[PDB]
Amino acid sequence: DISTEIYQAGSTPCNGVEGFNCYFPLQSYGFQPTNGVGYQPYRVVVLS
Amino acid sequence: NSASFSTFKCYGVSPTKLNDLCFTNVYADSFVIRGDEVRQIAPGQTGK
Structure with a gap:
């Protein structure tokens, strides 16, 4: 979308x-080095 | 669906969906907040 x-x-x-x-x-x-764990982004690749 | 409220933000569940899940033990209480903290008040505050 x-x-x-x-x-x-x-x-x-x-x-x-x-x-x-x-x-x-x-x-x-709101990415920030001081941001706590869990909020950190994870890059995900999906294969079909 | 009223025309007297501007800001509605919810994290636990979408406000629209309420017939399925039913709220229990909802409480309302008055607090004291100055006019300088219109949007500076939020849970988990570790400031002055």
Whole structure:
């Protein structure tokens, strides 16, 4: 899936521009050397 | 589904799905927080 479509989290639908109860589904990881164990990322390769 | 709340964030479970899993022993209590900690308050704080 590749689409920057604002999620319709709330009951009222919002289009074009995020409004009430509209949030971006994607956020990143706050990587940091001081970050604790478990939050660290693991590179995964999947073969089919 | 109300129009009086702006920010809803949940980690334990999606707020939408509530018929399947049922909450038990939910508590609400008032606390004192200044206006300078609008979003600087979070669990697990080891500051001043």
